[PDB]
Curated annotation (Swiss-Prot):
Organism of origin: Drosophila melanogaster (Fruit fly)
Record function comment: Has A-to-I RNA editing activity on extended dsRNA: edits RNA-binding protein Rnp4F. A-to-I editing of pre-mRNAs acts predominantly through nervous system targets to affect adult nervous system integrity, function and behavior. Essential for adaptation to environmental stresses, such as oxygen deprivation, and for the prevention of premature neuronal degeneration, through the editing of ion channels as targets.
Lineage: superkingdom: Eukaryota
Full-sequence portion shown in this chain: 48 to 140 of 676
DRBM domain residues: 14-80
Knockout mutant characteristics: Adult flies are morphologically wild-type but exhibit extreme behavioral defects including temperature-sensitive paralysis, locomotor uncoordination, and tremors which increase in severity with age.
Known tissue expression: Expressed in embryonic nervous system; late stage 13 sees ventral nerve cord expression which spreads to brain by stage 16. Expression is maintained through to adulthood.
GN (gene name): Adar
Record protein name field: Double-stranded RNA-specific editase Adar
Amino acid sequence: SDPKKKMCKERIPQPKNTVAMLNELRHGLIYKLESQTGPVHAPLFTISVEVDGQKYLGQGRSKKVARIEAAATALRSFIQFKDGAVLSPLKPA
């Protein structure tokens, strides 16, 4: 099927997003949709952000979500507090 979200003029105003955090940390970050799949009720978007040579992957139900997910991984790669969270999807098919 492939539900191709063509509308990118819709903002879905949700600041405090990790992608903004990444822009405060390191430049050269490219958020690119490497793969798009999933159902129509909740498709799976796979955004890859390449930062400092490390490609961080984020998989969400929209480009926006996936972009956030990608940046989240990147953030903890730079600064890492006493999080110790095992919340990290390792290739979830």
